[PDB]
Point group: C3
Chain length 311, copies 3
Amino acid sequence: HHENLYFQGMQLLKELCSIHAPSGNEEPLKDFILEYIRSNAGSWSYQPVIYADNDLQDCIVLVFGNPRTAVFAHMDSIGFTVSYNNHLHPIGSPSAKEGYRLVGKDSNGDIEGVLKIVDEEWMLETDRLIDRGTEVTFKPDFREEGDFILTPYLDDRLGVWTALELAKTLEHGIIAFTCWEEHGGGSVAYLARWIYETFHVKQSLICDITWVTEGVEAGKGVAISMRDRMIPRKKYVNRIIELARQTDIPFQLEVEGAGASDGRELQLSPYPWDWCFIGAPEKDAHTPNECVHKKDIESMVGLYKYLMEKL
Amino acid sequence: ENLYFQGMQLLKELCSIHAPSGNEEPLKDFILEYIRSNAGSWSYQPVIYADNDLQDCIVLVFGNPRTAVFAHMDSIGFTVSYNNHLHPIGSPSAKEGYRLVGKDSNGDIEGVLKIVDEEWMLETDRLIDRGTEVTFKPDFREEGDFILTPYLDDRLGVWTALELAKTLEHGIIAFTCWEEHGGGSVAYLARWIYETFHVKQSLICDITWVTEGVEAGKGVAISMRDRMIPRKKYVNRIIELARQTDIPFQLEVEGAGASDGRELQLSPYPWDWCFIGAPEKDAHTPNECVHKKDIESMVGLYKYLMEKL
Amino acid sequence: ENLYFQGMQLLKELCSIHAPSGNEEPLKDFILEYIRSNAGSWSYQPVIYADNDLQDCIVLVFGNPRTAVFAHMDSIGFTVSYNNHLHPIGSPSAKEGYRLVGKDSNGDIEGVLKIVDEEWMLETDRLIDRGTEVTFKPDFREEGDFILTPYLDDRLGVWTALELAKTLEHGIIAFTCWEEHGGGSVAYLARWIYETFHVKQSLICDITWVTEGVEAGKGVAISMRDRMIPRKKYVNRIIELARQTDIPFQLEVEGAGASDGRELQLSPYPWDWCFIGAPEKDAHTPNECVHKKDIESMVGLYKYLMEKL
Ligand SMILES: [Cl-]
Ligand SMILES: [Fe+3]
Ligand SMILES: [Fe+3]
Ligand SMILES: [Fe+3]
Ligand SMILES: [Fe+3]
Ligand SMILES: [Fe+3]
Ligand SMILES: [Fe+3]
């Protein structure tokens, strides 16, 4: 019984968060999203053309009608790579606190363990020698508390979820599910090329999750990043903000001095892409307790729906 | 009016236009109208490229080009975040007192840099709109054999490019964006120029540093390297050519700093590059200072090299 | 005579050729003369690609390729700046006494590394021309099961590549530049190879570190990751293949270090990559040391993978 293929709302998000897909091994998430799409697309207002193929590695690209804008959400999560003697290296920049519950699978089967900081080096405490190169991930632990949702990997399974929501009604546009976002990228680059060249699209939205801040508060609305480590074109961000205000959808304006997203890869590509990071903010980013307010999920989905239509 | 300035007056003007990384448009707009005013008086009329697929970049194509010169329009500055706190745009010098400027929905803006709570702020008359970019207060001084002003880097380069244009016969001049902050304009210019014109030689027209090795007024700097390393054979070719000249120049060898030349190097296109420009004291401060004789050499060397490469 | 060398003598010669990042030309020149003398003795004759549009890179195409191997010609070293001071080319080891060689307009250069005033420089005869590159003094040694020489990294890769060519039927072998220093050649190789031959699989033929996890003489290393992370399914495929073999290999898992693989990964083309090379002791020192049995595993595994991938 493959019931997950029809999950919805928070149950779908829970599923998405549960799927072990660290950077460099997004394949299982790609597989799920791909079947989910083929199982549900017929219920969408508009049927997209599905691109998944070798020249896209494990990426997925959806093209709805005649697109003008492309949205990018990353399937990869942070995590850790098992090295020698059950030692660990990070995949991306995860939080590393003793006791974090980590899961994975190797040739000897499932793996469960705890993160230990022995001799000032990180390692995986488990009942056996784990195969080298085995990736481990935060143990799924999906919680629904008050107006909140606490789970590992809201970044960016929430983004993936939002994208899929978007797909329910999206008429014109592109939804791209990317790889390696958490760990240096290298998928968006080819996506940047192909989308631009094939569809002549050069506007994007980065569907990812940001931080809750003294300046960006939980439940106060989806965040439009006017900049982070990188800086998009002010006129593009302005234009977005403008459209956002044609709405009663609550949003907050993020101005950070750090952090990067797929947007960076777009910016640095040899293709003249505009980009803007829009997404719900979370507390405890990159921890197994990523927390997001249900209202911001709601705002996020709403702004994406509106932006994708008017951009 | 200004659409007709010249010499140091034009420099002053270029230096006054608020164009930090990511918001180069106002400078683009000016440069573009300025070109359209003056091109007719130039020795050769280039084909002007500006538009959607170039974002806010400008590319001038003169004759049958063999070499492309790149000068960045964007300047360092600050981005007002929350409660008038600031983040850098590029890597500007930060010292309590620096005058900054800008405009929001509530009009013009003028502020001092306050380093309250070891965190950088914009002390100003009210709550500034978020994301509002602030720039060093335009203050143009002609002092001895020197020009002191915010943003010689790289408004001197843009200026130099515009001089070049007066007589350039064969070549490309590209005005770039985001150089001070990560780049991402040159990448597409690297592609388009190479693919369209088959040009793969470049000169990075930008400002470098005054050093015990590169002295003010001892001539334009030909960078043999920085953070990055261009092809020796290319650099040598340039130095050979420069030595065919009585134009003074100095050989810079740095272990740090990057430019538009880096973006080219790293592009999927077989670009040769070389950073060439005047040296300045107090880079990235509001007091950027260059020697008039180094400007002169810069212009001269650029003219020559563009004709000979 | 060198144009015919073999075995370790070919490696000695490769290691002796002064070719730091940004100036790989001499090695290119040697590799090309060499390929043109010996390709005839090979099982299959490749198509040679070296041009203006490849800068100083070389690309060999055997038959109908599915996979591309990349080996970097450039070596670490140092660039002489002002007053015989120095900057690093790549990340070389810095120890007083290190023997350095070069050549400027005043002939040959031989010197040592001096740490004067917390600052690095070259102690030599005379003032060295600015921007002159210097290199570890060749010192090829054969000692037990080991080879000790500067620049095993990546002359051993270059060497391995040349061996592979002796038998390779279908595949691409590319000799790269600037790998030790920010790269910028692979970017265009990635485009060109992918677009022209529809090849999107690679093996990075470079040398890694001897480690508590990767031991000398215990076989060639298949890197599951380093600073970067390749596609797990690709790496798995490689390991699977290696296991069909009696060739010894070790599974490397590092949290740092980059290769030409990174450039491929980050390119606008869907490259799979995997770093496979012998491990070395004392990397980036004049005493790089590798075990012959690992060189033999390396050659062996490349030959096999190129045939099976
Ligand atoms: Cl962000
Ligand atoms: Fe994310
Ligand atoms: Fe993240
Ligand atoms: Fe500059
Ligand atoms: Fe600068
Ligand atoms: Fe190497
Ligand atoms: Fe190396």
